[PDB]
């Protein structure tokens, strides 16, 4: 609300942009790498502790 | 002929309107002598 922008002086638009960028980079990492982590690897690609 | 015959044909006569005040009266600020003013965008 405009009341939030006007009264709450700590609030601004920059916090939203920073959070958007932060979540954006987190999403880049997630979409690119979550296939690696979440794959149900088969016994060929599993190596024990050894 | 007379002017009385042509009176009813109002479209012929030029239109002029009696310049009377219309609408509610202009409103003035009466509070200012009582009140002491402070203006800041960040209140």
Calpha distance A22→B11 (Å, rounded): 73
Of the candidates A25, A9, A28, the residue with the CA atom closest to the CA atom of residue A17: A25
Name the DSSP class of B31.
S
How far is the C-alpha of A33 from the C-alpha of A25, rounded, in Å?
12
The whole-angstrom separation of Cα A34 and Cα A27 is 10
Method used for this model?
Answer: cryo-EM
Instruction: Kindly state the DSSP code that residue B36 receives in the 8-state scheme.
Output: P
Cα-Cα-Cα-Cα dihedral sign, residues B30, B36, B41, B43: negative
Grouping H, G, I as helix, E, B as strand and the rest as coil, residue B19 is coil
Q: How far apart are the first and last CA of chain B?
A: 76
């Amino acid at each position: 609300t405009k009341e939030m922008k006007d009264f709450n002086q700590t609030f601004s638009v920059e916090i939203l942009n920073k959070s958007i960028g932060e979540s954006y980079n987190a999403l880049l990492n997630h979409i690119h790498l979550s296939p690696i982590i979440n794959f149900n690897y088969k016994a060929s690609n599993k190596t024990a502790f050894k | 002929m007379t002017f009385s015959s042509t009176s009813n044909l109002k479209e012929l006569l030029r239109k002029v309107v009696l310049d009377v005040e219309l609408g509610r009266e202009q409103v003035q600020l009466l509070y200012k002598p009582i009140y002491d003013s402070i203006a800041d965008s960040n209140l």
